[PDB]
């Protein structure tokens, strides 16, 4: 056996934007994993079409993290809402293993057709 | 001869069929082989014991045995459908071995089987393990690999000190006879990654799922995305194999006119020293899905970890 | 954790480096001059394959140094009251000096 | 000499490798031969090409 994600990951709320100041309000579904100091989020997903800036403050409250996003990827899934035409975005520079775990858990327990 | 011979006739399918049970009747065959493992219980690159296949060797004309095998797995029913789905998604790549799904009655139940056709006795993991854990009193796998692919013959292992690098530096000439096999394996790996990206398949590539001809199998840990978004993970494959590319001198064919070993060497300009574009072409041809940035000139690196990586 | 710090994690993990360093310092102690060495190691761990033996050095040198190390130029000592068989061209002796015993 | 300027002006940016200057501009060659078998295959006769 050689596997992708033995144990899974999580997600809390998040905000994003397009321009430098479009960092307005809670706008994504950003997954994350726990690091010893500072927690790194993996995948940005919501009903966003062209968004470049995904934002959240510093643990100190002093700064606020800045992120640039990639080009989009298509997918439509199943829910009692029905076909959710979404776009999920990966932060800049996400390597292949992290995308692998994200897509793994998502397509595993989050519907998709 | 209605349960050992009926099985042997169903395994042949519609291809050439001169097989022989490399074992006993319709029970399995156990062997000691090298694997690259990672689940939530165990990890490592070690030698384990395989226990769930029945292997048949193909005969040639004159009834001479050749290096082509049929490996018939046996397992549960959900893995069967999952593997069939993924295989039918990927079945048109030339770098994928040919599969065959069927059901058969063992005693009173219909058990599902998966057959893999014209495999090789050893994988790439066996070669890498043989060369990275060398012991001169226990090296039967290495000798068998060397003899099978016509690098040397069985009398080469009598002029003892045959393995030493300082005494008998002729062993480099023998190791360099395995190089074109390794180069062909690399090219097929890139093909397979492209197919995976197009179909929408996600999974990690390991050395024990490729035979010594270059073909791939075992899609049991692979999942599905939407087409155009597949992700191959290649980080232990390439780096575990890295020391073997300079020992076998795999990239030698790139000094010839058309990457053809039967042709003259390339004639270069005598005042040329840059070669930056050629390095990028080589990197794109053999390591297309290695996802860390490569700087041909190390004056543009970010720290000393980057310098090590790119050098 | 060693597997997933080699082939799955992409940056440095400081806690596990500290942990592995402590493990090595406890079960594998080294005295190093410029390419000479003496090691004191745990025997029970080495017989189960949890720390390096003399064969692991042979394999590592074969694939990372392009040399063959013969086991007729290595040594081992199972009694600690006679020190290293050799270090910087010196032998060792446990002699009585005054009131106690010292190594010369 | 003029051989030096000839190869230097054929370079696109002015730079050349140092290993090709004696190989292309030197006037005199020296060969060191270990045994007769090597002599037969390298410089037998009174003119050879290298
Ligand atoms: N190429 C090859 N490998 C063989 C043969 N017989 C045994 N093996 C070994 O058995 C392995 C095949 O195992 P298999 O049951 O197909 O599953 P797997 O390779 O572990 N991949 P998975 O992670 O999906 O289980 C090879 O990697 C190799 O180590 C043979 O005839 N040919
Ligand atoms: P995987 O590639 O699916 O199987 C490779 C090979 O390794 C085993 C052997 N035996 C093995 C050893 C230990 C474990 C664990 N903990 N989990 C799953 N598999 N193994 C397998 O039997 C298999 O043959
Ligand atoms: Mg299996
Ligand atoms: Zn670099």
From Swiss-Prot, chain C:
The gene is rep. It comes from Severe acute respiratory syndrome coronavirus 2. Interacts with nsp7 and nsp8 to form the replication-transcription complex (RTC): nsp12, nsp7, two subunits of nsp8, and up to two subunits of nsp13. Interacts with nsp9. The active site is at residues 34-36. It catalyses: RNA(n) + a ribonucleoside 5'-triphosphate = RNA(n+1) + diphosphate; a 5'-end diphospho-ribonucleoside in mRNA + GTP + H(+) = a 5'-end (5'-triphosphoguanosine)-ribonucleoside in mRNA + diphosphate. Inhibited by Remdesivir antiviral drug (GS-5734) through non-obligate RNA chain termination. RNA-directed RNA polymerase that catalyzes the transcription of viral genomic and subgenomic RNAs. Acts in complex with nsp7 and nsp8 to transcribe both the minus and positive strands of genomic RNA. The kinase-like NiRAN domain of NSP12 attaches one or more nucleotides to the amino terminus of NSP9, forming a covalent RNA-protein intermediate that serves as transcription/replication primer. This is RNA-directed RNA polymerase nsp12. Its cofactor is Mg(2+). Residues 1-90 are annotated as: RdRp Palm C-ter.
């Amino acid at each position: 056996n050689n596997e992708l994600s033995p144990v899974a990951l999580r997600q809390m709320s998040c905000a994003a934007g397009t321009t430098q100041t479009a960092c307005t309000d809670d706008n994504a579904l950003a997954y994350y994993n726990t690091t010893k100091g500072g927690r790194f989020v993996l995948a940005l997903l919501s009903d966003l079409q062209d968004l470049k800036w995904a934002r959240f403050p510093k643990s100190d409250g002093t700064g606020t993290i800045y992120t640039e996003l990639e080009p989009p990827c298509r997918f439509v899934t199943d829910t009692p809402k029905g076909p959710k035409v979404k776009y999920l975005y990966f932060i800049k520079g996400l390597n292949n293993l992290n995308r692998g775990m994200v897509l793994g858990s998502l397509a595993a327990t989050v519907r998709l057709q | 001869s209605a349960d050992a011979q009926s099985f042997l006739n169903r395994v042949c399918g519609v291809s050439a069929a001169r097989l022989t049970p490399c074992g006993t009747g319709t029970s399995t065959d156990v062997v000691y082989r090298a694997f690259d493992i990672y689940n939530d219980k165990v990890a490592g690159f070690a030698k384990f014991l395989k226990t769930n296949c029945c292997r048949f060797q193909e005969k040639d004309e004159d009834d001479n045995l050749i290096d082509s095998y049929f490996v018939v797995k046996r397992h549960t029913f959900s893995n069967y459908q999952h593997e069939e789905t993924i295989y039918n998604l990927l079945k048109d790549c030339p770098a994928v071995a040919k599969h065959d799904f069927f059901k058969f009655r063992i005693d009173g139940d219909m058990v599902p089987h998966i057959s893999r056709q014209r495999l090789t006795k050893y994988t790439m993991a066996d070669l890498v393990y043989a060369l990275r854990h060398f012991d001169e009193g226990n090296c039967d796998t290495l000798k068998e690999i060397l003899v099978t692919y016509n690098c040397c013959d069985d009398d080469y292992f009598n002029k003892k000190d045959w393995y030493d690098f300082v005494e008998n530096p002729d062993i480099l000439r023998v190791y360099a006879n395995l190089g074109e096999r390794v180069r062909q394996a690399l090219l097929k790996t890139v093909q397979f990654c492209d197919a995976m990206r197009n179909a929408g398949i996600v999974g990690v590539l390991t050395l024990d799922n490729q035979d010594l001809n270059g073909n791939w199998y075992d899609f049991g840990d692979f999942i599905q995305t939407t087409p155009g978004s597949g992700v191959p993970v290649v980080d232990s494959y390439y780096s575990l194999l890295m020391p073997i590319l300079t020992l076998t001198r795999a990239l030698t064919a790139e000094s010839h006119v058309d990457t053809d070993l039967t042709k003259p060497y390339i004639k270069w300009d005598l005042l040329k020293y840059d070669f930056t574009e050629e390095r990028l072409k080589l990197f794109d041809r053999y390591f297309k899905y290695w996802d860390q940035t490569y700087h041909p000139n190390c004056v543009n690196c970010l720290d000393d970890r980057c310098i090590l990586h790119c050098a | 954790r060693l597997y997933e710090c080699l082939y799955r994690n992409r940056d440095v993990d400081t806690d596990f480096v500290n942990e592995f360093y402590a493990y090595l310092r406890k079960h594998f102690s080294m005295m190093i001059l410029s390419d000479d060495a003496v090691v004191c190691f745990n025997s029970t761990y080495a017989s189960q394959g949890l720390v390096a033996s003399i064969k692991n050095f042979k394999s590592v040198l074969y694939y990372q140094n392009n040399v063959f190390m013969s086991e007729a130029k290595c040594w081992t000592e199972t009694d600690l009251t006679k020190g290293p068989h050799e270090f910087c061209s010196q032998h060792t002796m446990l002699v009585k000096q005054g009131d106690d015993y010292v190594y010369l | 000499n003029d051989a030096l300027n000839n190869i230097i002006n054929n370079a696109r940016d002015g730079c050349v490798p140092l290993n090709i200057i004696p190989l292309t501009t030197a006037a005199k060659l020296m060969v060191v031969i270990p045994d007769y078998n090597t002599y037969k295959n390298t410089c037998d006769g009174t003119t050879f090409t290298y």
